[PDB]
Structure 1
Amino acid sequence: PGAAEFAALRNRWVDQITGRNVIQAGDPDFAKAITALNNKAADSLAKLDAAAGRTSVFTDLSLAKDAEMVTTYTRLSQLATAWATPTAAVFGDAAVLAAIKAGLADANTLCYNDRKEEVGNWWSWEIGVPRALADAMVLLHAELSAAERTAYCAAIDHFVPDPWLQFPPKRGKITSVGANRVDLCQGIIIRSLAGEDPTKLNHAVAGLSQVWQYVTSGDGIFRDGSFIQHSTTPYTGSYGVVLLTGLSKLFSLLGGTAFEVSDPTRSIFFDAVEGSFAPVMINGAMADAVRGRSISREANTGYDLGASAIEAILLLARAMDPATAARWRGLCAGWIARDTYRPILNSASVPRTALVKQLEATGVAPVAEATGHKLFPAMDRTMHRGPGWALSLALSSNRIAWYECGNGENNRGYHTGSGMTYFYTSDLGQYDDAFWATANYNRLPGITVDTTPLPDKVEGQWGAAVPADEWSGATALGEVAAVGQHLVGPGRTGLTARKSWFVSGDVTVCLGADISTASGAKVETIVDHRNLHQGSNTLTTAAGTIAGTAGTVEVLGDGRWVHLEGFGGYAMLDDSPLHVLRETRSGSWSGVNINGSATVQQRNFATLYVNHGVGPVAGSYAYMVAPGASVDLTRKLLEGNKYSVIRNDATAQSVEFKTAKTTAATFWKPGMAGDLGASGPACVVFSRHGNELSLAVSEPTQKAAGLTLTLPEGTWSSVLEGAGTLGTDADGRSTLTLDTTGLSGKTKLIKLKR
């Protein structure tokens, strides 16, 4: 590949990043994308340092601060993008061009050059600047001189001599992985287009292959579809999206060329569209539970990341086989159509606009999110859906950190891995509308919490500490899931709790047992902590209403149920007092992220909780949530033994779903829950249909070689579906013995015949 091939590649990259070849004339959405492009460009030009002998490019960005160095370069690449976009205000403007070139030249001289040692965050030097400077070189290729290309290529190569590695020499260089490997390889590939370097280009393309190989530990994609970055944090929704985005752009750039990605194992990455990404996409947003510290970012939200994922999937779909293309397009049409809260075209780039318009021109229909369960045991996450809702559970364990904080972000998120119950609904803004600026970080929905105040950054940054718990894990059979978490509290309080969730097609039954702590403080369990925005949503009870006055907590009378207008129902499954608080909360994004705005946001919440008191001995809870239930259906939840608690203690927790004729259990110790026994830790769901017993089982520690069940519903003499060895114990009950060696928390499905 020579001059013509490199020119075609550069032209293709500019087409991709500007959308210059696909602007529809007179289209209002294209006009709006151009307007947003123009306003950002004008903002940057207004901030140019025009001073003689300047020591910065922009008056509000110091080159001595590595994040502001990155923003200097991303502003220059944005300006170059605008200069290259037909109909943009600065399109082809020579005075603007000259300012961009001078900015690149001075940022090189002053700071980012082949003689400079890294100072501060490695990512700035190796990923933030190279991607932007490479883009700028390609955008401006007809305008920069050879000597300028030499200088800027030399700078990139100094900081990133090999994109398969990361960190400056003084630190010791390690293999780059996951999103970091993609981003380093992107910067080098685009730089290799500018400099016409096939050797560097080929090595960077070859570096992509590692990121879609299945892993069983560390960072990457697991066979169950989990995605981890930073070793201990579930990360599909932020770092996973960075990986998805970069590969979409590079696969598209290189396809059909001498440099095309030809590794056949890239099918694993395509499999991850539905296996990893789609289940954690909720009406256009990535689930908070899989986006780590990014929850703290006012302008990098679940909708921003979901929109990036949609762009990427649409871009990838252009190269897929027809059935897969249409499936991915239907999925995206659904995530777009259902999201009226942050419509994808508002502030969309020209390329994003074009992909969304191309989708709408295919006529591919919107696909609904499927009901039922998607489990991710390698990352301690589960997803559950029914009509009008999606539950995302956020656990932690000896494999998965309580939380990630870092770079001044999410330092207060230490309870976000304490068994959170995110109920996503048609309230699309629930977790987005200043939730993370205003919520009570000590009363997040679903958690059990020791009320001891914890410092910011408790347990350390970067997910360095994990709870030394017994297990967290899950299974599911048909419409019912069983999820368990042994919660060990952050901050060395000694909090312990056994939390389980039994999730049907409509209702979530929440059981807690064996709760105690060493701190001497009260312990709570949060039934909900629910953003009401500026609403005054009524809390209805058997007797009338509760918590009508903000700031005065009330205890629920005897009917045991409460309905929250615009949400659904809650009901107590024991005689514990339920405390109900309507409250107004305030906070700024600066309070949760060092980069957040200082603007104070004020939001109303409904907060429902159980108080286990001081010094609980084997404290417990039992409640249920019915998203979307009317007052009439909520009033009836506790009637007819629909949700039949079997056991709830330090040995096992179990419920039977009457309508679904299905029982679910978690086992902490060897023992029995009803007529089901287990020899050790287990998640089990079972249902009898006449003379056939169906079971789902997991071994949630991920470390036991065997597990034996004592079977419910009488005796069982053959195996119809699946594996396992039938036996009989000294007492005449049938047993099922499973080899669980290496199952990594995955579910075994079994069907037996009487």
Structure 2
Amino acid sequence: PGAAEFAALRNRWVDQITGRNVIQAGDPDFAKAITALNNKAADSLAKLDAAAGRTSVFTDLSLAKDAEMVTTYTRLSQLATAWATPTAAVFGDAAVLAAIKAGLADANTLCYNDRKEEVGNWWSWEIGVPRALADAMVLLHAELSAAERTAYCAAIDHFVPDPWLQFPPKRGKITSVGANRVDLCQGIIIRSLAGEDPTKLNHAVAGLSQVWQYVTSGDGIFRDGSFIQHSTTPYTGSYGVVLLTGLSKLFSLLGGTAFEVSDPTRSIFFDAVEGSFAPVMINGAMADAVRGRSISREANTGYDLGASAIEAILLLARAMDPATAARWRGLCAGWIARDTYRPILNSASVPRTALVKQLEATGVAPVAEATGHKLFPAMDRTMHRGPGWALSLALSSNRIAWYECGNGENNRGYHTGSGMTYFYTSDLGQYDDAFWATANYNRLPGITVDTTPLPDKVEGQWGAAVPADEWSGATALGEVAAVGQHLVGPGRTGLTARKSWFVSGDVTVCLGADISTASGAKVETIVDHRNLHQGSNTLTTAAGTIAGTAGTVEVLGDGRWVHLEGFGGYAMLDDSPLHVLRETRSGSWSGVNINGSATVQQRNFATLYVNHGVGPVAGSYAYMVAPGASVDLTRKLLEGNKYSVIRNDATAQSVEFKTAKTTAATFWKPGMAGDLGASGPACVVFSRHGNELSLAVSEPTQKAAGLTLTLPEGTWSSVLEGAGTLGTDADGRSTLTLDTTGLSGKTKLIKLKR
């Protein structure tokens, strides 16, 4: 392959990034996209430093700050994009071209060149600048000199000699993985188009393959669909999206060329659309639980990330077999149609607009989010759905960090892994409308929490980023899931708690046991901490209303239920007092992210909690949540033994669902919970149907070779489905022995016959 093939690829890349081939005359969304492009370009031009011997390119960006050096280069690539977009205000404009070139020249001379060693964040030098600079080089190819292209390739090759690796030489270089691998490879692939380097191009394409190879520990994609980055953080929703975006663009660019991605194992990446990404998409937003430090970003939200995922999936759909293309497009049409809160076309690029219009033209119907349970044991995350709600649980364990912070971002997120219960609903903005600027980071929904204040950036014993806990894990059978977390508190307080969740098609039962701490501070468990936006949403009880006065906490009656207007119901399953607080909270994004704006956001919250007191001894809680329940349905929750607490202690926690005819349990120690027993740590859900017993079981430590259940519901003679060995115990009970070697927390489904 030669000059003609490289010119075609540069032109394909310019087509992709401008949409110049696909702009529709008179389409109002394309018109708004051209406006947004024009407004940004004009903002950047007006901010140009026009001075002789200027030491910056823009008056508001310092080249000595590595982040602002990146922004200097993305502004320049944006300007070059606009300059190349038909109908844009600066399209083909000579003065604008001159300004872009002078900007690239001066940034190189002053800062970003092959004689400069990196200072500050490696990512700026190796990913931020090279992707932008390379785009600019490709957009401006006809206008840039041989000398300019040489200098700019020399700079990129100096900082990124091999995109399979990262870090400046001073540091020891390590293998780049996941999102970083994709981004490094992208920068080199586009630079290789500008410099017509097939050797570098081919190496960089080959580098992509590692990112979709299954792993069994640490960074990457797991067979259960989990995606981990930063070694110990669930990351499908942010880094996973970066990966997804870059691959979509690169696969599209190279397709049907001499450089096309032909690694047949890329099917693993395609399988991740449904296996990894779709289950953590919620009405257009990536779940906060799988987006790590990005929750602290005012302008990199769950909806921003979901919209990026949708763009990518639509782009990838073009190359798939008909059935898969249609399935992906139907998933996307649903994520778009249900999202009336941040509609995808508002502020969309020209390329994104084109893909969303293309989707609308297929006539593919929106696909609903399926009810039920999607478990991700490798990353300590579960998803659960019913009509009108999605529950996302955020756990932590000896595999999964309490939280991830860095670069000034998410330093306060230390409780976000302490058993959070995110209930996503038709309140589409619940977690987006300045939630992370205003929420009480010590009273996040669902958590158990030692009230000891923790410093920003706190770590555990000996600098540990992961709790040395017993296990976190889950299983599910049909409509019911069992999830457990042995919580070890962050910040060396000595908090311990056994938290479990039993989730049906409608209601979530939350049990807690064995709670104590070493700090001397009171411990709380948070039934909810719920954004009311600017509302005065009523809290209704058997006795009338509660918490009518902001700032004055009240204790619930013996009615034991409370309904929150606009949300649903809560009910207590023990005698713990429930404290109910209506509160107005304020904060700026600058309080949670070094880059956040100073604007103060003020939001109303409803906060419902149990106080375990100071020095609890085997403290406990038991409550349930009924998203979408009316007042009348909430009043009825505790009637007729519908939700039965079978056991709630340091041995086991278990609930029977009457209507579902299903029982769920977590075991901490060998023992019985009602008529089910386990020989060690386990999650179990079981249901009898006539002469058959169905069970789901997991071995949640991920380290035991075997597990034996003592079966409920009498005698069992045969194993119809799944693997396992029946026996009988000393008391005449049937037992089921499982070989759990290497199961990695995955569920075994078993069906037995009488």
TM > 0.5: yes
- The question of whether the paired residues in 1 share the 8 Å contact of 2:460 and 2:467 is answered with no
How many angstroms apart in 1 are the aligned matches of 2:723 and 2:263? 35
- Asked if the contact 1:163–1:185 (Cα under 8 Å) also holds between the matched residues in 2, the reply is yes
1:218 Cα deviation after fit = 1.7
Counterpart contact for 1:495–1:515, Cα < 8 Å: yes
After TM superposition, the structure 1 stretch with the greater mean CA deviation from structure 2, 140-149 or 302-311, is: 140-149
- Any conservation in 2 of the 1:314–1:332 contact (CA below 8 Å)? yes
Deviations 1:645-664 (A, max 9, x none): 00000000000000000000
Deviation string for 1:308-353 (max 9, x for gaps)?
0000000000100000000000000000000000000000000000
Verify the 8 A CA contact 2:239 2:291 in the aligned structure 1. yes
Task: Give the distance between the partners of 2:7 and 2:142, measured in 1 at CA.
Answer: 10
Counterpart of 2:500 in structure 1 is: 500
* Alpha-carbon distance change, 294 to 158 in structure 1, aligned in 2, over 3 angstroms: same
The CA deviation at 1:146 is 1.3
Deviation at 1:575, TM superposition (A): 1.0
- Distance between the aligned counterparts of 1:708 and 1:232, measured in 2? 30
The structural deviation recorded for 1:730 is 1.3
Aligned partners of 2:293 and 2:599: how far apart in 1?
20
Q: Separation in 2 of the partners of 1:592 and 1:55?
A: 31
Q: How does 1:396-435 map to 2 (within 5 A)?
A: 396-435=396-435
Tell whether the 8 Å contact from 2:460 to 2:492 is kept in structure 1 after alignment. no
Contact 2:393/2:419 (<8 A) preserved: yes
CA contact (8 A) 1:404 1:461 kept: no
Deviations 1:679-715 (A, max 9, x none): 0000000000111000000000000000000000001
Per the TM alignment, residue 463 of structure 1 is displaced from its structure 2 partner at its CA by 9.8
Please give the per-residue CA displacement for 1:692-745, whole angstroms capped at 9, x wherever unaligned. 000000000000000000000001111011100001111111000000000000
Distance 1:57 1:462, change over 3 A: farther
Provide runs of 4+ in structure 1 moved above 3 Å: 460-464
Instruction: Please state how far the C-alpha of 1:462 moved relative to its aligned partner.
Output: 15
Contact 1:683–1:697 (CA under 8 A) maintained in structure 2: yes
Tell me if structure 1 keeps the 8 A contact 2:460–2:466.
no
1:318-397 correspondence to structure 2 within 5 Å: 318-397=318-397
Question: Which 10-residue stretch deviates more, 458-467 or 54-63?
Answer: 458-467
1:513 positional shift: 0.3
Task: Give SS of 1:736's match.
Answer: strand
CA deviations on 1:58-80 (whole Å, 9 max, x unpaired) are 01111111111100000000000
Deviation at 1:464, TM superposition (A): 5.5
Check 1:463–1:484 CA distance in 2 against 1; reply closer, same or farther (3 A cut): farther
**1:406–1:462 contact (8 Å) kept in structure 2:** no
Q: TM-score if structure 1 supplies the norm length?
A: 0.99
Partner of 1:194: 194
Distance 2:60 2:749 in 1: 60
Query: For each residue in 1:362-381, what CA deviation from the matched residue of structure 2 results, as whole angstroms up to 9, or x when unmatched?
Result: 00000000000000000000
The 1:232/1:464 distance shift into structure 2, 3 A limit, reads: farther
What is aligned with 1:474? 474
1:111-130: CA deviation from partner (whole Å, max 9, x where unpaired)? 10111100000000000000
Is the CA contact 2:332–2:366 (under 8 Å) kept in the aligned structure 1? yes
| Alpha-carbon separation, structure 1, partners of 2:562 and 2:35 | 48
1:568 and 2:568 are equivalent in the alignment = yes
- In structure 2, distance between residues paired with 1:460 and 1:709: 35
Query: Aligned equivalents of 1:205 and 1:317: distance in 2?
Result: 20
Conserved 8 A contact 1:401-1:463: no
How far did 1:674 drift? 0.1
Cα pair 1:232 1:464 within 8 Å, conserved? no
State whether residues 405 and 461 of structure 1, in contact with CA within 8 Å, keep that contact through their aligned partners in structure 2: no
Q: Secondary structure at the match of 2:391?
A: strand
1:147 deviates by: 1.3
| Shift of residue 360, structure 1, vs aligned partner | 0.3
Residue 442 of structure 1 deviates from its aligned partner by 0.2
Per-residue CA deviation, residues 62-108 of structure 1 (Å, 9 max, x unaligned), is 11111111000000000000000011110000000000000000101
Secondary structure of residue in 2 paired with 1:278? helix
Q: Structure 1: which 5+ residue stretches go unaligned?
A: none
Q: 1:143 to 1:464 in 2, by over 3 A?
A: farther
Question: Contact between 1:230 and 1:463, CA under 8 Å: does it hold in 2?
Answer: no
Decide whether aligned partners of structure 1 residues 171 and 204 sit closer, same or farther in structure 2, where only a CA change above 3 A counts. Answer: same
* 1:465 to partner: Cα distance: 1.1
Q: What SS does the corresponding residue of 1:392 show, helix, strand or coil?
A: strand
The answer to whether the 8 Å contact 2:405/2:413 transfers is: yes
Displacement after TM superposition at 1:460 (Å): 7.5
- Tell me the distance in 1 between the aligned counterparts of 2:50 and 2:344: 37
The SS at the match of 1:580 is: strand
- In 2, are the aligned partners of 1:663 and 1:687 still within 8 Å (CA)? yes
CA contact (8 A) 1:404 1:462 kept: no
Q: Over residues 36-62 of structure 1, what are the superposed CA-to-partner deviations in whole Å (9 max), with x where a residue is unaligned?
A: 101111111111000101111001111
- Once residues 464 and 207 of structure 1 are traced to their aligned partners in structure 2, the CA distance between those partners, rounded to angstroms, is 31
Distance 1:460 1:67 in 2: 30
- Structure 1 CA distance, aligned partners of 2:48 and 2:477? 61
Deviation at 1:358, TM superposition (A): 0.3
Alpha-carbon separation, structure 2, partners of 1:145 and 1:306 = 39
Contact 2:384 2:391 in 1 (8 A): yes
CA contact (8 A) 2:460 2:490 kept: no
Alpha-carbon distance between aligned partners in 2 of 1:602 and 1:566, rounded to the nearest angstrom: 19
Name the CA distance, whole Å, in 2 between partners of 1:407 and 1:397: 24
Measured in 1, the distance between the counterparts of 2:421 and 2:628 equals 15
Query: Distance between the aligned counterparts of 1:567 and 1:218, measured in 2?
Result: 37
Secondary structure, aligned partner of 2:133: helix
Contact 2:165-2:174 at 8 Å conserved across structures: yes
- Structure 1 contact 494–519 (Cα < 8 Å) conserved: yes
What does 1:527-546 correspond to in 2, within 5 Å? 527-546=527-546
In structure 1, distance between residues paired with 2:291 and 2:549: 35
State the distance in 1 between where 2:600 and 2:143 align. Answer: 46
On the 8 A contact 1:255/1:261 being kept in 2, the answer is: yes
Q: Secondary structure at the match of 1:223?
A: coil
Question: Does the CA-based 8 Å contact 2:131-2:183 persist in structure 1?
Answer: yes
Give CA deviations for 1:3-48 in whole Å, capped at 9, x if unaligned. 1110100000000000001000111100101101011111111110
Q: Give the Å deviation of 1:461.
A: 14
Please list the CA deviations of residues 353-411 of structure 1 after superposition, one character each: whole Å capped at 9, or x if unmatched. Answer: 00000000000000000000000000000000000000000000000000001000000
CA contact (8 A) 1:236 1:276 kept: yes
Cα RMSD of the aligned pairs, angstroms, is 1.0
Contact 1:284–1:303 (CA under 8 A) maintained in structure 2: yes
Given that 1:403 and 1:463 are in contact with CA atoms closer than 8 Å, whether structure 2 keeps it comes out as no
Aligned length: 754
Secondary structure of the residue aligned to 2:683 is strand
Change (3 A) 1:464 1:94: farther
Distance in 2, Cα, partners of 1:147 & 1:437: 48
SS at match of 2:119: coil
Asked if residue 444 in structure 1 is aligned to residue 429 in structure 2, the reply is no
Contact 2:460/2:491 (CA < 8 Å) preserved in 1?
A: no
* 1:586-618 CA distance string (max 9 Å, x none): 000000000000000000000000000110000
Paired with 1:672 and 1:331, the residues of 2 have a C-alpha distance of: 43
- Partners in 1 of 2:731 and 2:718 — Cα distance? 19
d(CA) in 1 for partners of 2:145, 2:363: 46
Render the CA deviation track for 1:410-456: whole Å, top value 9, x for unaligned: 00000000000000000000000000000000000000000000000
SS at match of 1:720: strand
> 1:405, 1:463 within 8 Å by CA — same for their partners in 2?
no
Between the aligned residues of both structures, percent identity stands at 100
Q: 1 CA distance for matches of 2:462 and 2:433?
A: 26
In 2 relative to 1, CA 245–107 (structure 1 residues): closer, same or farther, beyond 3 Å? same
CA distance in 2 between partners of 1:657 and 1:50 (Å): 71
SS in 1 for 2:669: coil
Q: 1:465-523 CA deviation, whole Å, 9 max, x = no partner?
A: 10000000000000000000000000111100000000000000000000000111100
1:241 is displaced (CA, Å) by 0.2
Match in the other structure for 1:237: 237
Contact 2:32 2:347 survives alignment (8 Å): yes
**2-side partners of 1:12 and 1:221: how far apart?**
30
Distance 1:646 1:438, change over 3 A: same
Q: What secondary structure sits across from 1:428 in the alignment? A: coil
2:497–2:516 CA contact under 8 A, matched in 1: yes
User: Which digits, 9 at most, give the CA deviation of each residue in 1:251-270, with x for residues without a partner?
Assistant: 00000000000000000000
Return the alpha-carbon distance in structure 1 between the equivalents of residues 729 and 711 of structure 2: 10
CA distance in 1, matches of 2:718, 2:362: 51
